[PDB]
Amino acid sequence: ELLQVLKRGLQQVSGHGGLRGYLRVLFRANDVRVGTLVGEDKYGNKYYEDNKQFFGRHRWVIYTTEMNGKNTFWDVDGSMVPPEWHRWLHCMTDDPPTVKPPTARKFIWTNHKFNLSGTPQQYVPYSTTRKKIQEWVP
Amino acid sequence: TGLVGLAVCETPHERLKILYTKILDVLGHIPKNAAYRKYTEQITNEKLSMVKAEPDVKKLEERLQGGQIEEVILQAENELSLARKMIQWKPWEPLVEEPPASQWKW
Amino acid sequence: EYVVAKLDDLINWARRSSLWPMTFGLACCAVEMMHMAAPRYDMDRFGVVFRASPRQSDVMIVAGTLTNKMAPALRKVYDQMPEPRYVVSMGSCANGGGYYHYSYSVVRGCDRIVPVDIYVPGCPPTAEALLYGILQLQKKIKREKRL
Amino acid sequence: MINILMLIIPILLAVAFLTLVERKVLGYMQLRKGPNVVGPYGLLQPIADAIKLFIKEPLRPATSSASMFILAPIMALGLALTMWIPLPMPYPLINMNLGVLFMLAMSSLAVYSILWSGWASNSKYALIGALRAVAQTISYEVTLAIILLSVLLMSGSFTLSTLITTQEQMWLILPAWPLAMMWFISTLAETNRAPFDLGPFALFFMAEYANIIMMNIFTAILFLGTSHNPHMPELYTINFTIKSLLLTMSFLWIRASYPRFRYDQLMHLLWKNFLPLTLALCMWHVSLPILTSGIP
Amino acid sequence: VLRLVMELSGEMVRKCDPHIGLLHRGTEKLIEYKTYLQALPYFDRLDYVSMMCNEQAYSLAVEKLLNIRPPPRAQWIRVLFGEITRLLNHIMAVTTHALDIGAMTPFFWMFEEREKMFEFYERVSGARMHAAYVRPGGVHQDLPLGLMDDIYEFSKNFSLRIDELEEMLTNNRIWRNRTVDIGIVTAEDALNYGFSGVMLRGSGIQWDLRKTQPYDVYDQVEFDVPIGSRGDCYDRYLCRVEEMRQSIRIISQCLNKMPPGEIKVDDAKVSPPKRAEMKTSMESLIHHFKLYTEGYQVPPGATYTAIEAPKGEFGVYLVSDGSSRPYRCKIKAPGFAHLAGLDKMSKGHMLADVVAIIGTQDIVFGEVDR
Amino acid sequence: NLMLALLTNFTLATLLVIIAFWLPQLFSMKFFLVAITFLLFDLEIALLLPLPWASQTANLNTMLTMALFLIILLAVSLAYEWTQKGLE
Amino acid sequence: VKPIFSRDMNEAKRRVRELYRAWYREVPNTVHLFQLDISVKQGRDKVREMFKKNAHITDPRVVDLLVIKGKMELEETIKVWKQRTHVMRFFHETEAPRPKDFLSKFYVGHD
Amino acid sequence: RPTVRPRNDVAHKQLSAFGEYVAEILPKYVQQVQVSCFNELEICIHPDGVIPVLTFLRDHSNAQFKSLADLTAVDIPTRQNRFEIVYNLLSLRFNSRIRVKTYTDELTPIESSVPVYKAANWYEREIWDMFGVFFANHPDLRRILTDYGFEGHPFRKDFPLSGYVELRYDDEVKRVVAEPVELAQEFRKFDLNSPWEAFPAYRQPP
Amino acid sequence: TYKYVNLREPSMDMKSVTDRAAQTLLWTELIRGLGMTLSYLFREPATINYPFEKGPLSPRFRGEHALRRYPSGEERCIACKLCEAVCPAQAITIEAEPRADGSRRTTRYDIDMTKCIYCGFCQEACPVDAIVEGPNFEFSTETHEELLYNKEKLLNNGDKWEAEIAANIQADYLYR
Numbered sequence A: 001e002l003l004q005v006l007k008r009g010l011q012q013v014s015g016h017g018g019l020r021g022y023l024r025v026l027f028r029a030n031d032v033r034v035g036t037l038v039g040e041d042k043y044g045n046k047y048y049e050d051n052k053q054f055f056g057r058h059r060w061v062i063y064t065t066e067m068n069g070k071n072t073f074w075d076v077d078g079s080m081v082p083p084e085w086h087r088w089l090h091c092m093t094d095d096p097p098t099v100k101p102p103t104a105r106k107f108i109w110t111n112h113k114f115n116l117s118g119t120p121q122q123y124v125p126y127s128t129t130r131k132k133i134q135e136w137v138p
Numbered sequence B: 001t002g003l004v005g006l007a008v009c010e011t012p013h014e015r016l017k018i019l020y021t022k023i024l025d026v027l028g029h030i031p032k033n034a035a036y037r038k039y040t041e042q043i044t045n046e047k048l049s050m051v052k053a054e055p056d057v058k059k060l061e062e063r064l065q066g067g068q069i070e071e072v073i074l075q076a077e078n079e080l081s082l083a084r085k086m087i088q089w090k091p092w093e094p095l096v097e098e099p100p101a102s103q104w105k106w
Numbered sequence C: 001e002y003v004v005a006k007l008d009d010l011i012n013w014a015r016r017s018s019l020w021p022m023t024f025g026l027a028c029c030a031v032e033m034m035h036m037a038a039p040r041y042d043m044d045r046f047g048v049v050f051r052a053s054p055r056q057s058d059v060m061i062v063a064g065t066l067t068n069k070m071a072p073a074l075r076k077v078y079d080q081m082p083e084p085r086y087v088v089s090m091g092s093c094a095n096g097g098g099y100y101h102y103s104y105s106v107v108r109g110c111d112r113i114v115p116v117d118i119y120v121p122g123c124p125p126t127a128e129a130l131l132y133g134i135l136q137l138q139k140k141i142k143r144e145k146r147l
Numbered sequence D: 001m002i003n004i005l006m007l008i009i010p011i012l013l014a015v016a017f018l019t020l021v022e023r024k025v026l027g028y029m030q031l032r033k034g035p036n037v038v039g040p041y042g043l044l045q046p047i048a049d050a051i052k053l054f055i056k057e058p059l060r061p062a063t064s065s066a067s068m069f070i071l072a073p074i075m076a077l078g079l080a081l082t083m084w085i086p087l088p089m090p091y092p093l094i095n096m097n098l099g100v101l102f103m104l105a106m107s108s109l110a111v112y113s114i115l116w117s118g119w120a121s122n123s124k125y126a127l128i129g130a131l132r133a134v135a136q137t138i139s140y141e142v143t144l145a146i147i148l149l150s151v152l153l154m155s156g157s158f159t160l161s162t163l164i165t166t167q168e169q170m171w172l173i174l175p176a177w178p179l180a181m182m183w184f185i186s187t188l189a190e191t192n193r194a195p196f197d198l199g200p201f202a203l204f205f206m207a208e209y210a211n212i213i214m215m216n217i218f219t220a221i222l223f224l225g226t227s228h229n230p231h232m233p234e235l236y237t238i239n240f241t242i243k244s245l246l247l248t249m250s251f252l253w254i255r256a257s258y259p260r261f262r263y264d265q266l267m268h269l270l271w272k273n274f275l276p277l278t279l280a281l282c283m284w285h286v287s288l289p290i291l292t293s294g295i296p
Numbered sequence E: 001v002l003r004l005v006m007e008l009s010g011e012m013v014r015k016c017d018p019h020i021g022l023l024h025r026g027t028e029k030l031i032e033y034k035t036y037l038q039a040l041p042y043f044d045r046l047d048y049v050s051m052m053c054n055e056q057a058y059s060l061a062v063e064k065l066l067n068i069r070p071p072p073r074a075q076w077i078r079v080l081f082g083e084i085t086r087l088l089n090h091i092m093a094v095t096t097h098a099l100d101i102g103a104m105t106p107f108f109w110m111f112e113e114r115e116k117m118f119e120f121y122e123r124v125s126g127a128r129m130h131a132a133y134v135r136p137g138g139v140h141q142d143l144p145l146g147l148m149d150d151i152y153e154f155s156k157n158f159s160l161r162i163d164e165l166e167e168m169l170t171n172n173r174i175w176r177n178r179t180v181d182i183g184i185v186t187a188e189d190a191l192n193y194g195f196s197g198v199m200l201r202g203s204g205i206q207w208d209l210r211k212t213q214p215y216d217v218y219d220q221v222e223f224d225v226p227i228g229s230r231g232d233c234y235d236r237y238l239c240r241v242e243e244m245r246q247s248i249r250i251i252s253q254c255l256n257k258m259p260p261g262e263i264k265v266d267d268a269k270v271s272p273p274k275r276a277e278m279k280t281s282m283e284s285l286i287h288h289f290k291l292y293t294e295g296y297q298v299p300p301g302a303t304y305t306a307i308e309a310p311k312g313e314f315g316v317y318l319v320s321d322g323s324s325r326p327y328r329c330k331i332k333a334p335g336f337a338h339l340a341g342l343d344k345m346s347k348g349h350m351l352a353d354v355v356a357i358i359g360t361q362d363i364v365f366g367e368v369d370r
Numbered sequence F: 001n002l003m004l005a006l007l008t009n010f011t012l013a014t015l016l017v018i019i020a021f022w023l024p025q026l027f028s029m030k031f032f033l034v035a036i037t038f039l040l041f042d043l044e045i046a047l048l049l050p051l052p053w054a055s056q057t058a059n060l061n062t063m064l065t066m067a068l069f070l071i072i073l074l075a076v077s078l079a080y081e082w083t084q085k086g087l088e
Numbered sequence G: 001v002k003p004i005f006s007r008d009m010n011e012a013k014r015r016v017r018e019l020y021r022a023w024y025r026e027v028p029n030t031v032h033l034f035q036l037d038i039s040v041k042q043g044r045d046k047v048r049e050m051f052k053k054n055a056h057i058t059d060p061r062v063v064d065l066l067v068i069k070g071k072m073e074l075e076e077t078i079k080v081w082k083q084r085t086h087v088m089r090f091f092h093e094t095e096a097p098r099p100k101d102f103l104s105k106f107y108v109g110h111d
Numbered sequence H: 001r002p003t004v005r006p007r008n009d010v011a012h013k014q015l016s017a018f019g020e021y022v023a024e025i026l027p028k029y030v031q032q033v034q035v036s037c038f039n040e041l042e043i044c045i046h047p048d049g050v051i052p053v054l055t056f057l058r059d060h061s062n063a064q065f066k067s068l069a070d071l072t073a074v075d076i077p078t079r080q081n082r083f084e085i086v087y088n089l090l091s092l093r094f095n096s097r098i099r100v101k102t103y104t105d106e107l108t109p110i111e112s113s114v115p116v117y118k119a120a121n122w123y124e125r126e127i128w129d130m131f132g133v134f135f136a137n138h139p140d141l142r143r144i145l146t147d148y149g150f151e152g153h154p155f156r157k158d159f160p161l162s163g164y165v166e167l168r169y170d171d172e173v174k175r176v177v178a179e180p181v182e183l184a185q186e187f188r189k190f191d192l193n194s195p196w197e198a199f200p201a202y203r204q205p206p
Numbered sequence I: 001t002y003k004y005v006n007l008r009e010p011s012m013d014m015k016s017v018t019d020r021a022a023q024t025l026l027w028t029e030l031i032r033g034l035g036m037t038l039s040y041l042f043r044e045p046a047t048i049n050y051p052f053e054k055g056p057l058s059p060r061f062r063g064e065h066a067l068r069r070y071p072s073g074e075e076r077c078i079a080c081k082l083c084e085a086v087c088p089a090q091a092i093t094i095e096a097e098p099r100a101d102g103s104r105r106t107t108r109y110d111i112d113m114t115k116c117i118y119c120g121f122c123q124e125a126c127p128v129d130a131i132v133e134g135p136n137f138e139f140s141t142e143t144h145e146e147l148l149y150n151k152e153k154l155l156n157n158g159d160k161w162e163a164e165i166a167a168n169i170q171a172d173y174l175y176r
């Protein structure tokens, strides 16, 4: 019973990477876990699942290194990951590249965009009406 | 044995009989033509007959109370205060106050 | 030259590590702010400590609705705060009066009393969305004092 | 004389690295995850709190009365660090002529740290709550002296080095069964925030948590021992640290598990109830060396 | 949150006048301009803890004006969600009360379980906390297929989870030391304040609204009401935990009795018709156009309704015109009743006792508005 | 040295205060009765302090009657604290 | 008669006099206990301009209600209540303030 | 009817007995108008005596109410007499809900319900706050839901929803929070009122 | 119904008195209370770290507003002022003008996030299903101006969430 607990941790470190791979899942990632991975998403997103662990949990998933133009690996928010949030991430049971396909309409954006934030190229308010016209000419 | 309320459950009979006989006399001081005396007296006389017939039975306490004698004693305790206030301020005997303005429908 | 640029990030890393918020129980939002303590969604000792205290805290979360009675009350709390202070307006009431707004008593915007750095739009501000407010605060701290 | 610096610098690190233990061990008690994002297991956070509070965090005093407020943390940190000197350990730094008398003296002077902070604020609003915090510490120091003497009267003089030698085969928990229960409660009165709770403000944290480790070690001398071994210093050093760490878990156990006892009923647990109990056991411990031969 | 002006003779309180109302949102004048369907989400956002217990009092008030009964299925959802709020409120009636004292564990022990409770709310309605779910037309949306298996799965593990608090808090010496003998008020003078939920129910009078006045399919479901003996803070806390252990009986009976049928009222002058229905048929979409924008067209008259809140009551008093806008109403939350009690509750007690009074009465500051 | 050991702790404690100070640039008389009783009891503790260090050469029979005597009167002083102490 | 209110015609005037003395004594006291703010002399001038707007007196019913209100908004200082120099301040600090003239208001264009 | 009707009238005739019993006393001082609809009873009371009506229903041999719990007030500018203070009363022993109303304009003081009911004083403060109705012989009449520097009464239909003093700036003054600024965002006044009468029998002849 | 909270004297004589005295003399029940947290420490905690793991949700959840469109181009919003009047916060504003020639679909369309208490009422009142509430959490700004939504545009930029919306609405027609 005691020997099986120590051996399970050794198999997890040996599986995902090794010496340099395990450090990436320890320093950058909050929690280290090994399991089945889909590995099909826009940019450098992995999105893993199938792991048991606890109720309402779908593996490590892992954040992307350089999603669009942020070029950050140490710090990344939920700006990453394409249309999959309502799929295998939380709500639906079927995986986005395995069973349930995304619908095409040629209206949705091909490249996924990050959060607006305080950085340039962000959200803005704009006027709509042409207003009451007034003109005077000689 | 003790009641759930703050009022202490004391084993006292005829205590209800004294207070119910006291209030009948107060009603027959000032109002006589008023309906307040004519209606309250027949309820109290109906309740007094149940006390005289049943000797310390829980069924007597269950009649129009059903929360032991302690709750029934509180009904008699404030009855003397209610009768004295009705005797002091004339409302039951006299009716002469002005009518309201004609509006009620919303 | 190189040491000057790297030392500035080290001071910014100290606030990126831990942020102590004020526990204002002035809302329904405050119950969702108590869900930050609830184990399922946690920033507790990830950065957030629920000790609060009016003076020692670096962050203050303005939870939801503010009335004209609390308008002088919340202002004097802000003065007691240390110089590195960040104000999060968690909830639609805090952003500009989610409900009410046109009402007589409720103060619109919160910025009329206390300036806001991070806005959280949600009425019942889901703990998932509340996790952004602290993570964005940590990301927003980039450069302080060049000269 | 270099060993003094080897008993301040690793000790200040021990108070710093408490921040991990004080909310991760406390975390699993409350089913929450503590430090995780900052380090590999949050080991970078304790030192990160130091960079946050010391350098960048500025001051805004209420009145600043010339010498005070910038003198109270010196009394807080100074008295907490000087308590480490008389400690027996495997070997003590500059061993005093009498041990435990120095231990009780610097703890009784540590009451001033919360006294001068009450005088720092000009307002009447703070000093009433400040004097209430003094009452939590001042009252329990009466009993703390009594329960100490009962252990000493069993075996050994005031010297802390003799207390290790007397525990050769069996611990002092078994002969002092009700007295061992007292040291679990009485130590928590000194600003531990478990039975009762009230820049320079950050320095008080470094002093108050330092006393928590100090009471954990001091309980592991008066009641724990197991073995001495003068020839092997290796065996004692490892075995002493594990015993002290188990008492540190029990200090954080009361902080999470149990609500505050009220200030008025803190004076009903003690004085009304504990003081008749402690003195009755003190009466018993006077008779013990007379009934059966037990004199150092 | 609370100002609380204190008068102290040495150490103990002589006069405790709570100068409150620091969160008067001004719902009084504001609802007057809004229509009935427009006024619905105000009631959820009144109290900070109760969600489905709110709107319940408001919807039934409109239902007593319209004289139209909600469908037999929807009434069983109302109890299933009415008792689930009796779980939510009585968690916070214990946890924040213990957090105000100084207890750390019982707050976090229950909030793991309480976060699982909002998974039910999210799967049944849009937002986490507040939902526009209980409506004058009964129930807005039906339960999904996943939820009915989850309620049974939750309740099976719940009985041990609530009993973990009793072996933690009630058995301990600390609570028998602290909360025992604080403001023992049970007399006719205690009845002269009118608390309804707990207090009078918790100690003294055997009266409760659940047994006396049915709302939506009551007396058919077996109820157990805890009534103590002493009017102190400890016995007023024990009954709340005894409410929690004798609440799963209702939820299990809600799972036992579920007749399949209508979700909204079939009459399309009160509740909007189905989305598949409105797109094809004519009268459905015109009624959809007029039940939205324009209100309900309510019958005129003054009506008073009170459904048992875990805190006390929601005495909604709607006064109605011929128009779609309800002209003035007042939500009679027990916040006005509980804070008025502090004039008598504080007599001969310490500053630390005052915090225990607020917690046991459960004065969540959202209550005081109307 | 005891003087060298004590002064090193205080000088490092003073230095920690300057770090935060210099670097950055941009009623009820019922409490009194508790305090007095602390002093009066600790003096009885001061008389009962020598016990483990004193009882080595002196006769036990002469000491036994006198050693308990101080603790008995220390309980009598607490017995006077039971006849209405107050709300504290 | 109906309705009573508190006083009948002439008695209502002397209730204002008793109210005036109580508020005149508090304005020097609400400088040291509260804050300096403006001035002690300027605070007393704020009293006189307040009673000039209220000066009409046609019925004792209107006068009596002003006494109860006068023993509330001016009572927000005597028994020590929190305001923090924000509440109970009557004078405008940020007022423009506008004037009533056909040359001053018409130049700005309003209504 | 199966889903259309809420409840059939059965206790309506039983509750109508109360509409006779209190009216059998017949005071012009007390009774006036008795309305009974939808399992509920409503009584309006002449301003001269409100306390004698509240001492009644309290105790009493026939019906025991005791709890004079919840207390509301109605603002209506249609009538010559403006305000309508509405008492909601509940019985524990009897299990019934009765209503007590006042018909007076009550800009002039009205008699207090404090000597009869203990919690009534807190509700009486709210009526003086929102509506501005003074209670005679009242102990401690203090502002609760209104601001400390608030002018007028916040609920009255005579003035707008936004008010006169509502916006509170900080700007130029270091500590003083502003008050005199009055402007707010535009609340869209909906003119949604349906043509044709909603219900028959409710129509009154001009 | 009655349940009773009072124990009514648990101790009677000799045996029942001593054990009730033993818990007050030493502790026992405090040591028993210590054991409750002891086993609670060993069992695995349910914790979710946000930048990597995500919490549970639902097919129908309301977050940030985004207006949908038809599969073959064309803005689905028809301009009614229907959602304007239902809105309890009055966050949504709509002023409509004819689009070039023939078609009449919107001009001004602002939804305030300073207001909006999130109902799904505008989702329900909409006959064409234009505003559909998508699973959104990420929204954080420096100003009110950046927070309040402009004339469609940013609402039309919800195409990044419209792929999820199209999946979520398939669980919405014939409700659950």
Ligand SMILES: NC(=O)c1ccc[n+]([C@@H]2O[C@H](COP(=O)([O-])OP(=O)(O)OC[C@H]3O[C@@H](n4cnc5c(N)ncnc54)[C@H](OP(=O)(O)O)[C@@H]3O)[C@@H](O)[C@H]2O)c1
Binding pocket: none
């Ligand atoms: N009471 C008096 O002292 C007095 C008497 C008579 C007249 N005045 C007049 O009133 C004015 C008072 O202003 P002040 O002294 O209060 O202003 P200040 O405190 O010096 O603030 C000026 C700000 O502008 C920025 N700034 C200015 N020049 C800059 C540059 N070349 N590069 C980068 N940043 C620059 C500074 O930012 P950084 O710090 O980040 O560079 C600084 O924060 C003066 O202009 C003076 O003519 C004053």
Ligand code: SF4
Binding pocket: C027, C028, C029, C063, C064, C065, C090, C091, C092, C093, C094, C098, C099, C122, C123, C124, C125, E045, I117
């Ligand atoms: S935004 Fe919503 S949840 Fe937050 S305080 Fe306002 S109404 Fe309550």
Ligand code: SF4
Binding pocket: I076, I077, I078, I079, I080, I081, I082, I083, I084, I094, I125, I126, I127, I128, I129, I130, I131
């Ligand atoms: S969102 Fe829907 S209801 Fe609103 S204007 Fe557009 S089409 Fe009409």
Ligand code: SF4
Binding pocket: I086, I087, I088, I089, I090, I091, I092, I111, I115, I116, I117, I118, I119, I120, I121, I122, I123
């Ligand atoms: S969710 Fe509610 S408040 Fe928000 S825009 Fe829609 S109707 Fe208005």
